[PDB]
Structures are given as C-alpha cells and as structure tokens.
Design a binder for this molecule. Structure first.
Ligand SMILES: OC[C@H]1O[C@@H](S[C@@H]2O[C@H](CO)[C@@H](O)[C@H](O)[C@H]2O)[C@H](O)[C@@H](n2cc(Sc3ccccc3)nn2)[C@H]1O
Length: 138
C-alpha cells in the first residue's frame, strides 16, 4: 500500500529489456490515471487512461519538453475497469516503450526522448489505490 501520488526512482535511467510493473486497484468511480516517466522536468512518456472524455474511455500518451506537451497519441482500446485490481507492465525496447495491462498487449510508444539513461523517475498518480511499483531485467 503506497500513497498516491508516488515517485519511483529509476537509478541510472532506463535501458532496453527493463520491465517496470505497477500493481493496484482502480477506484470505484475513477476518471483518470497517469504514469509519468521523467527526465528531470521533462516527461519522456506520459500514459493517461481517461474514463470519461466526452463519454468515451480513451488512452492518451504524450511527451512534455520544456514544460510544453507535444502531439498526443490516442487509442480507443481500453482495458481498465472501475473497482478492479490491475497490473500495468511497461517494457523498454530499443525503439519504443511497450505497455501491457493484465497480461494483454495494449500499445507501443516510440522514443522521442533518446537519453534513456536519464529517465530517472516514474510518477504514479490519479484514481487508484497503489499496491506496489518495481522493476526487473528480463
Ligand atoms: O497532452 C497530454 C495532456 O493533456 C491534458 S488535456 C489536453 O488539453 C489540451 C489543451 O487544453 C487540449 O488541446 C487536448 O485536447 C487535451 O487532451 C491533460 O490535462 C494532461 N494531464 C492529464 C493528467 S492525469 C491527472 C490529473 C490530475 C491529477 C492526477 C492525474 N495530468 N495532466 C495530459 O494528459
């Protein structure tokens, strides 16, 4: 049981074949969740489930540079359900982050920030009860 918002240090940044696992439970009337993989103040990879944007559920992903959001990447495949236990796995690959939820592939996001070994924090926020956050090499 971890207090949200939660900061997970990623020592020496990320690297291909590093797997980051987030476990928790979605709150009963959730509206939003966010994962923010940060390089200093920049956000290399923002992963943002939205449960009610114009009465649709959507995943929004983006990058923040010098305090400005860039081009959003959107999709309607949406695996989360309010009130349920979830697992998000983010696997760093050479050209992209890959995300799987509850053991089903969800999306990939190409690397816009290229200094991977400087992406040294993961922020976890929004409408969840967070159980644990950790990493391993596969
Ligand atoms: O681009 C990614 C960002 O998008 C904006 S919303 C964006 O705003 C633009 C300008 O008005 C419109 O042009 C676009 O159409 C529209 O999508 C979101 O507010 C950004 N966010 C999401 C979250 S979660 C969260 C929020 C509070 C507390 C905990 C977790 N925290 N920050 C980010 O997701």
């Amino acid at each position: 049981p971890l207090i949200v918002p939660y900061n997970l240090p990623l020592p020496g940044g990320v690297v291909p074949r590093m797997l980051i696992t987030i476990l928790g439970t979605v709150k009963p009337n959730a509206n939003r969740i966010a994962l923010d993989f940060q390089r200093g103040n920049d956000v290399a990879f923002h992963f943002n489930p939205r449960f009610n944007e114009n009465n649709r559920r959507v995943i929004v992903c983006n990058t923040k540079l010098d305090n400005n959001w860039g081009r959003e990447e959107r999709q309607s495949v949406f695996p989360f359900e309010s009130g349920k236990p979830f697992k998000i796995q983010v696997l760093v690959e050479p050209d992209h982050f890959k995300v799987a939820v509850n053991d089903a592939h969800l999306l990939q996001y190409n690397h816009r920030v290229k200094k991977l070994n400087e992406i040294s924090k993961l922020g976890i926020s929004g409408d969840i009860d967070l159980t644990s956050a950790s990493y391993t090499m596969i």
